[PDB]
Amino acid sequence: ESRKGQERFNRWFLTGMTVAGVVLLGSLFSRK
């Protein structure tokens, strides 16, 4: 909502941390 450009997704390195998210998605996404 804020006028700031920041609403765009965090700088790509901080996306690297987002990979730390999906890796948890990599487990939960399916039962063995």
Side-chain angles (χ1 to χ4, degrees):
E1 297 183 349
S2 183
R3 296 185 302 93
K4 296 184 185 277
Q6 295 176 343
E7 298 298 342
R8 295 183 69 196
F9 290 95
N10 303 318
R11 296 184 302 191
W12 218 268
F13 295 96
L14 304 180
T15 322
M17 295 192 302
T18 314
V19 186
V22 306
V23 294
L24 302 176
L25 302 173
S27 296
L28 281 85
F29 182 90
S30 299
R31 186 182 184 78
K32 187 183 187 299

PDB file of all heavy atoms in Angstrom:
ATOM      1  N   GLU A   1       0.857  -1.219   0.000  1.00  0.00           N
ATOM      2  CA  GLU A   1       0.000   0.000   0.000  1.00  0.00           C
ATOM      3  C   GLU A   1       0.878   1.249   0.000  1.00  0.00           C
ATOM      4  O   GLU A   1       0.579   2.225  -0.688  1.00  0.00           O
ATOM      5  CB  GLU A   1      -0.893  -0.006   1.242  1.00  0.00           C
ATOM      6  CG  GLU A   1      -1.837  -1.212   1.192  1.00  0.00           C
ATOM      7  CD  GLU A   1      -2.813  -1.221   2.373  1.00  0.00           C
ATOM      8  OE1 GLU A   1      -2.638  -0.441   3.300  1.00  0.00           O
ATOM      9  OE2 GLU A   1      -3.736  -2.019   2.333  1.00  0.00           O
ATOM     10  N   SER A   2       1.960   1.214   0.772  1.00  0.00           N
ATOM     11  CA  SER A   2       2.844   2.369   0.878  1.00  0.00           C
ATOM     12  C   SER A   2       3.357   2.790  -0.496  1.00  0.00           C
ATOM     13  O   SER A   2       3.628   1.951  -1.355  1.00  0.00           O
ATOM     14  CB  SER A   2       4.029   2.035   1.785  1.00  0.00           C
ATOM     15  OG  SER A   2       4.838   3.193   1.942  1.00  0.00           O
ATOM     16  N   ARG A   3       3.488   4.098  -0.690  1.00  0.00           N
ATOM     17  CA  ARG A   3       3.992   4.639  -1.951  1.00  0.00           C
ATOM     18  C   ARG A   3       5.381   4.098  -2.307  1.00  0.00           C
ATOM     19  O   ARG A   3       5.749   4.058  -3.482  1.00  0.00           O
ATOM     20  CB  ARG A   3       4.063   6.163  -1.852  1.00  0.00           C
ATOM     21  CG  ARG A   3       2.652   6.731  -1.682  1.00  0.00           C
ATOM     22  CD  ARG A   3       2.698   8.262  -1.702  1.00  0.00           C
ATOM     23  NE  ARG A   3       3.581   8.766  -0.647  1.00  0.00           N
ATOM     24  CZ  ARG A   3       4.882   9.040  -0.830  1.00  0.00           C
ATOM     25  NH1 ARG A   3       5.489   8.829  -1.973  1.00  0.00           N
ATOM     26  NH2 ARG A   3       5.570   9.521   0.169  1.00  0.00           N
ATOM     27  N   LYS A   4       6.150   3.683  -1.303  1.00  0.00           N
ATOM     28  CA  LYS A   4       7.526   3.258  -1.525  1.00  0.00           C
ATOM     29  C   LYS A   4       7.619   2.128  -2.547  1.00  0.00           C
ATOM     30  O   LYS A   4       6.747   1.263  -2.623  1.00  0.00           O
ATOM     31  CB  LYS A   4       8.147   2.794  -0.206  1.00  0.00           C
ATOM     32  CG  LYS A   4       8.228   3.970   0.768  1.00  0.00           C
ATOM     33  CD  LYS A   4       8.946   3.526   2.044  1.00  0.00           C
ATOM     34  CE  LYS A   4       8.920   4.662   3.068  1.00  0.00           C
ATOM     35  NZ  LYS A   4      10.032   5.613   2.782  1.00  0.00           N
ATOM     36  N   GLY A   5       8.694   2.156  -3.329  1.00  0.00           N
ATOM     37  CA  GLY A   5       9.021   1.062  -4.244  1.00  0.00           C
ATOM     38  C   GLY A   5       9.177  -0.287  -3.528  1.00  0.00           C
ATOM     39  O   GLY A   5       9.130  -1.338  -4.168  1.00  0.00           O
ATOM     40  N   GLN A   6       9.365  -0.260  -2.209  1.00  0.00           N
ATOM     41  CA  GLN A   6       9.697  -1.457  -1.443  1.00  0.00           C
ATOM     42  C   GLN A   6       8.684  -2.586  -1.635  1.00  0.00           C
ATOM     43  O   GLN A   6       9.022  -3.750  -1.409  1.00  0.00           O
ATOM     44  CB  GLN A   6       9.784  -1.104   0.043  1.00  0.00           C
ATOM     45  CG  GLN A   6      10.947  -0.132   0.266  1.00  0.00           C
ATOM     46  CD  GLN A   6      11.002   0.314   1.725  1.00  0.00           C
ATOM     47  OE1 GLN A   6      10.029   0.168   2.467  1.00  0.00           O
ATOM     48  NE2 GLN A   6      12.095   0.859   2.185  1.00  0.00           N
ATOM     49  N   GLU A   7       7.457  -2.264  -2.046  1.00  0.00           N
ATOM     50  CA  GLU A   7       6.432  -3.299  -2.207  1.00  0.00           C
ATOM     51  C   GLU A   7       6.906  -4.418  -3.144  1.00  0.00           C
ATOM     52  O   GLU A   7       6.459  -5.558  -3.024  1.00  0.00           O
ATOM     53  CB  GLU A   7       5.154  -2.677  -2.775  1.00  0.00           C
ATOM     54  CG  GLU A   7       4.602  -1.642  -1.789  1.00  0.00           C
ATOM     55  CD  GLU A   7       4.226  -2.288  -0.452  1.00  0.00           C
ATOM     56  OE1 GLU A   7       4.070  -3.499  -0.401  1.00  0.00           O
ATOM     57  OE2 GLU A   7       4.098  -1.550   0.512  1.00  0.00           O
ATOM     58  N   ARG A   8       7.806  -4.097  -4.073  1.00  0.00           N
ATOM     59  CA  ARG A   8       8.484  -5.118  -4.865  1.00  0.00           C
ATOM     60  C   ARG A   8       9.185  -6.120  -3.954  1.00  0.00           C
ATOM     61  O   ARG A   8       9.652  -5.767  -2.871  1.00  0.00           O
ATOM     62  CB  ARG A   8       9.512  -4.475  -5.799  1.00  0.00           C
ATOM     63  CG  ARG A   8       8.800  -3.589  -6.822  1.00  0.00           C
ATOM     64  CD  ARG A   8       9.830  -3.008  -7.793  1.00  0.00           C
ATOM     65  NE  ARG A   8      10.379  -4.071  -8.642  1.00  0.00           N
ATOM     66  CZ  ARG A   8      11.504  -3.938  -9.360  1.00  0.00           C
ATOM     67  NH1 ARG A   8      12.206  -2.829  -9.360  1.00  0.00           N
ATOM     68  NH2 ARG A   8      11.914  -4.943 -10.084  1.00  0.00           N
ATOM     69  N   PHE A   9       9.254  -7.373  -4.395  1.00  0.00           N
ATOM     70  CA  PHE A   9       9.863  -8.432  -3.597  1.00  0.00           C
ATOM     71  C   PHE A   9      11.285  -8.061  -3.186  1.00  0.00           C
ATOM     72  O   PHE A   9      11.990  -7.353  -3.904  1.00  0.00           O
ATOM     73  CB  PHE A   9       9.893  -9.739  -4.392  1.00  0.00           C
ATOM     74  CG  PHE A   9       8.530 -10.356  -4.594  1.00  0.00           C
ATOM     75  CD1 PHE A   9       7.811 -10.104  -5.769  1.00  0.00           C
ATOM     76  CD2 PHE A   9       7.986 -11.185  -3.606  1.00  0.00           C
ATOM     77  CE1 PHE A   9       6.548 -10.679  -5.954  1.00  0.00           C
ATOM     78  CE2 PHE A   9       6.723 -11.762  -3.792  1.00  0.00           C
ATOM     79  CZ  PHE A   9       6.004 -11.508  -4.967  1.00  0.00           C
ATOM     80  N   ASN A  10      11.691  -8.548  -2.018  1.00  0.00           N
ATOM     81  CA  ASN A  10      12.972  -8.193  -1.419  1.00  0.00           C
ATOM     82  C   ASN A  10      14.125  -8.496  -2.371  1.00  0.00           C
ATOM     83  O   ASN A  10      14.001  -9.336  -3.263  1.00  0.00           O
ATOM     84  CB  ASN A  10      13.166  -8.974  -0.119  1.00  0.00           C
ATOM     85  CG  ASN A  10      12.008  -8.696   0.835  1.00  0.00           C
ATOM     86  OD1 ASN A  10      11.572  -7.553   0.969  1.00  0.00           O
ATOM     87  ND2 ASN A  10      11.481  -9.683   1.508  1.00  0.00           N
ATOM     88  N   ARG A  11      15.250  -7.807  -2.174  1.00  0.00           N
ATOM     89  CA  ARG A  11      16.405  -7.941  -3.062  1.00  0.00           C
ATOM     90  C   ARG A  11      16.796  -9.410  -3.208  1.00  0.00           C
ATOM     91  O   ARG A  11      16.614 -10.210  -2.290  1.00  0.00           O
ATOM     92  CB  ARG A  11      17.584  -7.162  -2.478  1.00  0.00           C
ATOM     93  CG  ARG A  11      17.244  -5.670  -2.442  1.00  0.00           C
ATOM     94  CD  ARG A  11      18.454  -4.875  -1.945  1.00  0.00           C
ATOM     95  NE  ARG A  11      18.857  -5.339  -0.614  1.00  0.00           N
ATOM     96  CZ  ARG A  11      19.741  -4.692   0.160  1.00  0.00           C
ATOM     97  NH1 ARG A  11      20.314  -3.574  -0.216  1.00  0.00           N
ATOM     98  NH2 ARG A  11      20.037  -5.191   1.329  1.00  0.00           N
ATOM     99  N   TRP A  12      17.293  -9.772  -4.385  1.00  0.00           N
ATOM    100  CA  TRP A  12      17.323 -11.178  -4.770  1.00  0.00           C
ATOM    101  C   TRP A  12      18.074 -12.039  -3.751  1.00  0.00           C
ATOM    102  O   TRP A  12      17.746 -13.215  -3.587  1.00  0.00           O
ATOM    103  CB  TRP A  12      17.975 -11.312  -6.154  1.00  0.00           C
ATOM    104  CG  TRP A  12      17.337 -12.354  -7.016  1.00  0.00           C
ATOM    105  CD1 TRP A  12      17.720 -13.649  -7.095  1.00  0.00           C
ATOM    106  CD2 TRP A  12      16.210 -12.204  -7.927  1.00  0.00           C
ATOM    107  NE1 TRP A  12      16.898 -14.304  -7.994  1.00  0.00           N
ATOM    108  CE2 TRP A  12      15.952 -13.457  -8.534  1.00  0.00           C
ATOM    109  CE3 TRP A  12      15.396 -11.115  -8.282  1.00  0.00           C
ATOM    110  CZ2 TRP A  12      14.919 -13.621  -9.461  1.00  0.00           C
ATOM    111  CZ3 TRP A  12      14.358 -11.276  -9.212  1.00  0.00           C
ATOM    112  CH2 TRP A  12      14.120 -12.525  -9.801  1.00  0.00           C
ATOM    113  N   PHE A  13      19.048 -11.459  -3.047  1.00  0.00           N
ATOM    114  CA  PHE A  13      19.748 -12.240  -2.024  1.00  0.00           C
ATOM    115  C   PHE A  13      18.773 -12.655  -0.918  1.00  0.00           C
ATOM    116  O   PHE A  13      18.840 -13.757  -0.366  1.00  0.00           O
ATOM    117  CB  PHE A  13      20.886 -11.415  -1.422  1.00  0.00           C
ATOM    118  CG  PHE A  13      21.984 -11.094  -2.409  1.00  0.00           C
ATOM    119  CD1 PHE A  13      21.981  -9.867  -3.084  1.00  0.00           C
ATOM    120  CD2 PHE A  13      23.004 -12.022  -2.648  1.00  0.00           C
ATOM    121  CE1 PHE A  13      22.998  -9.569  -3.998  1.00  0.00           C
ATOM    122  CE2 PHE A  13      24.022 -11.724  -3.562  1.00  0.00           C
ATOM    123  CZ  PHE A  13      24.019 -10.497  -4.237  1.00  0.00           C
ATOM    124  N   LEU A  14      17.978 -11.673  -0.497  1.00  0.00           N
ATOM    125  CA  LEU A  14      16.905 -11.985   0.444  1.00  0.00           C
ATOM    126  C   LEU A  14      15.919 -13.011  -0.121  1.00  0.00           C
ATOM    127  O   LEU A  14      15.302 -13.759   0.641  1.00  0.00           O
ATOM    128  CB  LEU A  14      16.144 -10.706   0.814  1.00  0.00           C
ATOM    129  CG  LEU A  14      17.097  -9.642   1.376  1.00  0.00           C
ATOM    130  CD1 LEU A  14      16.301  -8.383   1.723  1.00  0.00           C
ATOM    131  CD2 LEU A  14      17.779 -10.157   2.646  1.00  0.00           C
ATOM    132  N   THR A  15      15.810 -13.111  -1.446  1.00  0.00           N
ATOM    133  CA  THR A  15      15.129 -14.273  -2.051  1.00  0.00           C
ATOM    134  C   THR A  15      15.858 -15.588  -1.752  1.00  0.00           C
ATOM    135  O   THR A  15      15.261 -16.654  -1.639  1.00  0.00           O
ATOM    136  CB  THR A  15      14.954 -14.104  -3.564  1.00  0.00           C
ATOM    137  OG1 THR A  15      14.638 -12.750  -3.850  1.00  0.00           O
ATOM    138  CG2 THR A  15      13.807 -14.996  -4.044  1.00  0.00           C
ATOM    139  N   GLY A  16      17.173 -15.489  -1.614  1.00  0.00           N
ATOM    140  CA  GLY A  16      17.988 -16.649  -1.267  1.00  0.00           C
ATOM    141  C   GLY A  16      17.490 -17.243   0.048  1.00  0.00           C
ATOM    142  O   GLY A  16      17.306 -18.456   0.180  1.00  0.00           O
ATOM    143  N   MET A  17      17.237 -16.364   1.012  1.00  0.00           N
ATOM    144  CA  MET A  17      16.582 -16.810   2.243  1.00  0.00           C
ATOM    145  C   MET A  17      15.206 -17.405   1.944  1.00  0.00           C
ATOM    146  O   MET A  17      14.793 -18.394   2.560  1.00  0.00           O
ATOM    147  CB  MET A  17      16.442 -15.670   3.254  1.00  0.00           C
ATOM    148  CG  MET A  17      17.831 -15.225   3.716  1.00  0.00           C
ATOM    149  SD  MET A  17      17.672 -14.135   5.153  1.00  0.00           S
ATOM    150  CE  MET A  17      16.621 -12.878   4.389  1.00  0.00           C
ATOM    151  N   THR A  18      14.519 -16.847   0.946  1.00  0.00           N
ATOM    152  CA  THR A  18      13.227 -17.410   0.544  1.00  0.00           C
ATOM    153  C   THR A  18      13.384 -18.854   0.071  1.00  0.00           C
ATOM    154  O   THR A  18      12.440 -19.640   0.164  1.00  0.00           O
ATOM    155  CB  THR A  18      12.528 -16.566  -0.528  1.00  0.00           C
ATOM    156  OG1 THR A  18      12.593 -15.194  -0.164  1.00  0.00           O
ATOM    157  CG2 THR A  18      11.059 -16.989  -0.613  1.00  0.00           C
ATOM    158  N   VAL A  19      14.550 -19.202  -0.484  1.00  0.00           N
ATOM    159  CA  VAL A  19      14.833 -20.606  -0.784  1.00  0.00           C
ATOM    160  C   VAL A  19      14.812 -21.443   0.499  1.00  0.00           C
ATOM    161  O   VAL A  19      14.412 -22.605   0.484  1.00  0.00           O
ATOM    162  CB  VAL A  19      16.195 -20.766  -1.473  1.00  0.00           C
ATOM    163  CG1 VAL A  19      16.380 -22.221  -1.909  1.00  0.00           C
ATOM    164  CG2 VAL A  19      16.273 -19.858  -2.703  1.00  0.00           C
ATOM    165  N   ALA A  20      15.226 -20.847   1.618  1.00  0.00           N
ATOM    166  CA  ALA A  20      15.094 -21.516   2.919  1.00  0.00           C
ATOM    167  C   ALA A  20      13.629 -21.804   3.264  1.00  0.00           C
ATOM    168  O   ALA A  20      13.321 -22.779   3.960  1.00  0.00           O
ATOM    169  CB  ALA A  20      15.708 -20.640   4.013  1.00  0.00           C
ATOM    170  N   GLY A  21      12.726 -21.037   2.669  1.00  0.00           N
ATOM    171  CA  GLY A  21      11.306 -21.306   2.830  1.00  0.00           C
ATOM    172  C   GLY A  21      10.922 -22.543   2.024  1.00  0.00           C
ATOM    173  O   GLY A  21      10.492 -23.557   2.576  1.00  0.00           O
ATOM    174  N   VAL A  22      11.081 -22.453   0.709  1.00  0.00           N
ATOM    175  CA  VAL A  22      10.634 -23.537  -0.171  1.00  0.00           C
ATOM    176  C   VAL A  22      11.292 -24.876   0.155  1.00  0.00           C
ATOM    177  O   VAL A  22      10.711 -25.930  -0.113  1.00  0.00           O
ATOM    178  CB  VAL A  22      10.833 -23.188  -1.654  1.00  0.00           C
ATOM    179  CG1 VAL A  22      10.164 -21.847  -1.960  1.00  0.00           C
ATOM    180  CG2 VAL A  22      12.322 -23.091  -1.987  1.00  0.00           C
ATOM    181  N   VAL A  23      12.493 -24.836   0.733  1.00  0.00           N
ATOM    182  CA  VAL A  23      13.108 -26.112   1.134  1.00  0.00           C
ATOM    183  C   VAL A  23      12.232 -26.801   2.187  1.00  0.00           C
ATOM    184  O   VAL A  23      12.027 -28.022   2.138  1.00  0.00           O
ATOM    185  CB  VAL A  23      14.554 -25.983   1.620  1.00  0.00           C
ATOM    186  CG1 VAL A  23      15.442 -25.551   0.454  1.00  0.00           C
ATOM    187  CG2 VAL A  23      14.642 -24.948   2.727  1.00  0.00           C
ATOM    188  N   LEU A  24      11.647 -26.012   3.101  1.00  0.00           N
ATOM    189  CA  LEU A  24      10.609 -26.567   3.970  1.00  0.00           C
ATOM    190  C   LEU A  24       9.368 -26.973   3.171  1.00  0.00           C
ATOM    191  O   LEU A  24       8.703 -27.956   3.507  1.00  0.00           O
ATOM    192  CB  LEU A  24      10.212 -25.537   5.033  1.00  0.00           C
ATOM    193  CG  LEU A  24      11.439 -25.122   5.850  1.00  0.00           C
ATOM    194  CD1 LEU A  24      11.036 -24.029   6.843  1.00  0.00           C
ATOM    195  CD2 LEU A  24      11.982 -26.326   6.623  1.00  0.00           C
ATOM    196  N   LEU A  25       9.085 -26.247   2.088  1.00  0.00           N
ATOM    197  CA  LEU A  25       8.055 -26.702   1.144  1.00  0.00           C
ATOM    198  C   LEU A  25       8.458 -28.017   0.463  1.00  0.00           C
ATOM    199  O   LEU A  25       7.620 -28.877   0.205  1.00  0.00           O
ATOM    200  CB  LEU A  25       7.687 -25.635   0.104  1.00  0.00           C
ATOM    201  CG  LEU A  25       7.199 -24.368   0.812  1.00  0.00           C
ATOM    202  CD1 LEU A  25       6.991 -23.258  -0.220  1.00  0.00           C
ATOM    203  CD2 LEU A  25       5.871 -24.651   1.520  1.00  0.00           C
ATOM    204  N   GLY A  26       9.766 -28.219   0.292  1.00  0.00           N
ATOM    205  CA  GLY A  26      10.280 -29.411  -0.386  1.00  0.00           C
ATOM    206  C   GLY A  26       9.986 -30.697   0.398  1.00  0.00           C
ATOM    207  O   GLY A  26       9.938 -31.786  -0.174  1.00  0.00           O
ATOM    208  N   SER A  27       9.792 -30.561   1.711  1.00  0.00           N
ATOM    209  CA  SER A  27       9.447 -31.699   2.550  1.00  0.00           C
ATOM    210  C   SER A  27       7.930 -31.878   2.598  1.00  0.00           C
ATOM    211  O   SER A  27       7.386 -32.885   2.145  1.00  0.00           O
ATOM    212  CB  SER A  27       9.984 -31.487   3.965  1.00  0.00           C
ATOM    213  OG  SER A  27      11.404 -31.450   3.925  1.00  0.00           O
ATOM    214  N   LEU A  28       7.266 -30.870   3.157  1.00  0.00           N
ATOM    215  CA  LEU A  28       5.826 -30.918   3.407  1.00  0.00           C
ATOM    216  C   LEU A  28       4.986 -31.144   2.148  1.00  0.00           C
ATOM    217  O   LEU A  28       3.875 -31.667   2.244  1.00  0.00           O
ATOM    218  CB  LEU A  28       5.376 -29.619   4.082  1.00  0.00           C
ATOM    219  CG  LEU A  28       5.727 -29.658   5.573  1.00  0.00           C
ATOM    220  CD1 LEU A  28       7.173 -29.207   5.781  1.00  0.00           C
ATOM    221  CD2 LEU A  28       4.793 -28.722   6.343  1.00  0.00           C
ATOM    222  N   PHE A  29       5.505 -30.770   0.979  1.00  0.00           N
ATOM    223  CA  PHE A  29       4.659 -30.725  -0.215  1.00  0.00           C
ATOM    224  C   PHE A  29       4.038 -32.087  -0.531  1.00  0.00           C
ATOM    225  O   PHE A  29       2.953 -32.149  -1.111  1.00  0.00           O
ATOM    226  CB  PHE A  29       5.459 -30.243  -1.430  1.00  0.00           C
ATOM    227  CG  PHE A  29       4.634 -30.132  -2.693  1.00  0.00           C
ATOM    228  CD1 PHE A  29       3.982 -28.933  -2.999  1.00  0.00           C
ATOM    229  CD2 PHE A  29       4.518 -31.232  -3.553  1.00  0.00           C
ATOM    230  CE1 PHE A  29       3.214 -28.831  -4.166  1.00  0.00           C
ATOM    231  CE2 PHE A  29       3.751 -31.131  -4.719  1.00  0.00           C
ATOM    232  CZ  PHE A  29       3.099 -29.930  -5.026  1.00  0.00           C
ATOM    233  N   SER A  30       4.716 -33.172  -0.162  1.00  0.00           N
ATOM    234  CA  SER A  30       4.189 -34.507  -0.418  1.00  0.00           C
ATOM    235  C   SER A  30       4.581 -35.477   0.693  1.00  0.00           C
ATOM    236  O   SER A  30       5.678 -35.386   1.244  1.00  0.00           O
ATOM    237  CB  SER A  30       4.716 -35.026  -1.757  1.00  0.00           C
ATOM    238  OG  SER A  30       4.277 -34.163  -2.797  1.00  0.00           O
ATOM    239  N   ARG A  31       3.690 -36.409   1.013  1.00  0.00           N
ATOM    240  CA  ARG A  31       4.056 -37.527   1.874  1.00  0.00           C
ATOM    241  C   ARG A  31       4.873 -38.527   1.064  1.00  0.00           C
ATOM    242  O   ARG A  31       4.654 -38.666  -0.141  1.00  0.00           O
ATOM    243  CB  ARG A  31       2.801 -38.207   2.422  1.00  0.00           C
ATOM    244  CG  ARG A  31       3.204 -39.279   3.437  1.00  0.00           C
ATOM    245  CD  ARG A  31       1.955 -40.002   3.942  1.00  0.00           C
ATOM    246  NE  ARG A  31       2.317 -40.959   4.991  1.00  0.00           N
ATOM    247  CZ  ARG A  31       2.587 -40.604   6.257  1.00  0.00           C
ATOM    248  NH1 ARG A  31       2.529 -39.359   6.662  1.00  0.00           N
ATOM    249  NH2 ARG A  31       2.911 -41.532   7.114  1.00  0.00           N
ATOM    250  N   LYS A  32       5.810 -39.219   1.707  1.00  0.00           N
ATOM    251  CA  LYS A  32       6.659 -40.170   0.997  1.00  0.00           C
ATOM    252  C   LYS A  32       5.809 -41.246   0.327  1.00  0.00           C
ATOM    253  O   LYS A  32       4.805 -41.626   0.908  1.00  0.00           O
ATOM    254  CB  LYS A  32       7.637 -40.821   1.977  1.00  0.00           C
ATOM    255  CG  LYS A  32       8.643 -41.681   1.212  1.00  0.00           C
ATOM    256  CD  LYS A  32       9.565 -42.390   2.206  1.00  0.00           C
ATOM    257  CE  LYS A  32      10.676 -43.115   1.446  1.00  0.00           C
ATOM    258  NZ  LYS A  32      10.077 -44.142   0.549  1.00  0.00           N
TER     259      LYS A  32
END
